[PDB]
Design a binder for this molecule. Sequence first.
Ligand SMILES: CCn1ccc(CNC)n1
Length: 182
Amino acid sequence: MGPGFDFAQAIMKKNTVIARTEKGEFTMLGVYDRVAVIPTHASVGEIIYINDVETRVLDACALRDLTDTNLEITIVKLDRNQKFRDIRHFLPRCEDDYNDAVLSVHTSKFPNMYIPVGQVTNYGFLNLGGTPTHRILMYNFPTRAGQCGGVVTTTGKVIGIHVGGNGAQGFAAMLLHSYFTD
Ligand SMILES: CCn1ccc(CNC)n1
């Protein structure tokens, strides 16, 4: 409808795949080369389905901060025959608050979904499903099941991936440029 949705659509149409694990279908953001991210609770194994094609996982790393606290981001390298558009220059360098964000989802169940979630708070600590978690972003939208891995953007920035909700608020894990240096 507007420049927020324009940027979100541009990211969804080139930098997402549908990831299936034994724990469900997830929106999966490709970042560069064959490297993508997914919430850690997807429990990635040695094999994953990518757009319903059996795909070997070459590496998977569940990120934790330097206090050894869960970040809820898993970085996956896929044995795919094609690279993602490199979007690392759209990642923020530092923890921050944001205005006017969009949460975008693409699964079998929720294709072409875009939600204007509004103001995003640097919330920080969250007890996420019993697990102490750092670097959490919060937005005041009643997010539901199946939206996990959905991409949080502002105009010009890819800032996080949706990892949870409490029925009234939704929570995302930060994406930082420093996660994807090579
Ligand atoms: C079944 C109709 N419906 C309303 C919202 C949604 C998806 N959640 C954002 N689905």
